[PDB]
Ligand binder design. Structure first.
Ligand SMILES: O=C1NCCCCn2cc(cn2)-c2cnc3ccc(cc3c2)CCn2nc(ccc2=O)-c2ccc1c(C(F)(F)F)c2
Length: 285
């Protein structure tokens, strides 16, 4: 009922969606994530994940969020989370329907002590993330929050770059600082040096975050900079100090992470260059 209703291409009838409100699989600031059952266009069942935006209650603030995230329906890539559609009911907020990911976020899956991913598995995950970011970079899309907690893992061990568009939220409050006066949500220990100083974000700052994601993988979910507080993080980086090399990180892989953290954003590699270099490491040893 507001302006551009070209959302009809992705509208789901409420009678074609069942939301299992008893099963929470994720808690964001805008709303929770639930299990769901969706009747496809061909009439078959599928698992799905429903994201509620119940906590943002303002017709203008909601219309701004929907127009910002509706771009994700046009993206198509095996390493990027797709949109199944949105369901609008007369009992409030809109619901975002997304494909179900059997293993949840990437970081929780590798932190789990009952899982045995090999060193080749972890390198392969990072390669899948680089391929997803290469797609988003060619479409001129800056993510702003790339981390292991924001990447999903489906049944076939496929990694989906997530937490963007209509799925953007804070899913783990511990690692974010809420800015006074702008209200921006800043993941301090994942941000490029130039982003901590100006609060601007580019694809080159996405590359910095990607290097931190690689460090996350080779440590199987360790928290970055455990001995540096959120104030000293900027002087620590200005001194040229960086994250140390994990015990079981091959040397060429640590060099790729050091290339991602160069002081000049320009001097950093592109995601296309990262796809070439990581694949080579994967195919040998
Ligand atoms: O609590 C979390 N995991 C604790 C143990 C996992 C339990 N579990 C979760 C599912 C199945 N089991 C699950 C299955 N399919 C999904 C399909 C789409 C979506 C979420 C889905 C979640 C879109 C929403 N979205 N969510 C996240 C990241 C990006 C994103 O876009 C995100 C979800 C959960 C959690 C976290 C974090 F680790 F950060 F904290 C983060």
């Amino acid at each position: 009922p507001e302006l551009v209703q070209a959302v009809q291409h992705v509208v789901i009838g409420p009678s074609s969606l069942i939301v299992h409100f008893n099963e929470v699989i994720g808690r964001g600031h805008f709303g929770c994530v639930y299990h769901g059952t969706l009747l496809d266009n061909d009439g078959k069942k599928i698992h799905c994940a429903v994201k509620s935006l119940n906590r943002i209650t303002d017709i203008g603030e909601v219309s701004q969020f929907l127009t910002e995230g509706i771009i994700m329906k046009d993206f198509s890539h095996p390493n990027v989370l797709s949109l199944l559609g949105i369901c609008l009911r007369s009992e409030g907020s809109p619901l975002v329907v997304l494909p179900y990911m059997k293993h949840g976020d990437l970081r929780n899956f590798i932190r789990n002590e009952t899982h045995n991913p090999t060193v080749k598995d972890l390198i392969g995950f990072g390669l899948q993330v680089a391929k997803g970011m290469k797609y988003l970079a060619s479409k001129k899309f800056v993510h702003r929050d790339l981390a292991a907690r924001n990447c999903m893992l489906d049944e076939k061990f496929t990694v989906k770059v997530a937490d963007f568009g209509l799925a953007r939220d804070m899913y783990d409050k511990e690692y974010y600082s809420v800015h006074n006066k702008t209200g921006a949500k800043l993941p301090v220990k994942w941000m490029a040096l130039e982003s901590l100083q100006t609060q601007k974000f580019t694809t080159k700052s996405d590359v910095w975050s990607f290097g931190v994601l690689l460090w996350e993988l080779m440590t199987r979910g360790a928290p970055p900079y455990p001995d540096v507080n959120t104030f000293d993080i900027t002087v620590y980086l200005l001194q040229g100090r960086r994250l140390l090399q994990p015990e079981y990180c091959p040397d060429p892989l640590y060099e790729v992470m050091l290339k991602c953290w160069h002081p000049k954003a320009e001097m950093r590699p592109s995601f296309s260059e990262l796809v070439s270099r990581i694949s080579a490491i994967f195919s040998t040893f």
